[PDB]
């Protein structure tokens, strides 16, 4: 739906991570009414009907539980982590962390793209893969 399923606690999340089967997870840590928070969440609303085959995606509350906070490492909001059949997949992005994407997509195309790429190498068993996006639209922050 345009209006993304909300996780709200530990268990909640433990749960999407297991639950999602052959999709790619999109796991959103922000909060609703933050201004990069809006931007990126009218990207994933917009783009999630036509992603349905190869990718879930979800808000997570990071004011409602910080434990998956903590184990990202998440400093800032928003952080987007890809998993995969329970297991975190990372992005090289060109920045040095790819466990998570920082900030907001510059497009709606920039994720489609990205999510193109997770999904396929994640179903021929990859665990990190090259992000497609041109390094002009990753936030640099
Ligand atoms: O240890 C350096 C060696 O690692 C590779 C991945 O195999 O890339 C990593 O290190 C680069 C240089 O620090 C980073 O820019 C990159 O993000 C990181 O994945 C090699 O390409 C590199 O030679």
Do not use: W
Request: net charge neutral; aromatic share 12%; glycine share 4%.
């Amino acid at each position: 739906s345009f209006l993304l399923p909300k996780l709200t606690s530990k268990k909640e999340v433990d749960q999407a991570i297991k639950s999602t089967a052959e999709k790619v997870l999109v796991l959103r840590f922000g909060r609703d009414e933050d201004p990069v928070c809006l931007q990126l969440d009218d990207i994933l609303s917009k783009t999630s009907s036509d992603l349905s085959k190869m990718a879930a995606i979800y808000l997570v509350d990071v004011d409602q539980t910080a434990v998956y906070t903590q184990y990202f490492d998440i400093s800032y909001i928003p952080s987007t982590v890809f998993f995969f059949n329970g297991q975190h997949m990372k992005v090289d992005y060109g920045s040095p962390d790819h466990t998570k994407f920082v900030g907001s997509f510059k497009t709606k195309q920039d994720f489609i793209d990205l999510i193109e790429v997770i999904y396929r190498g994640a179903m021929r068993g990859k665990l990190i893969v090259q992000s497609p996006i041109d390094p002009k639209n990753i936030p640099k922050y």
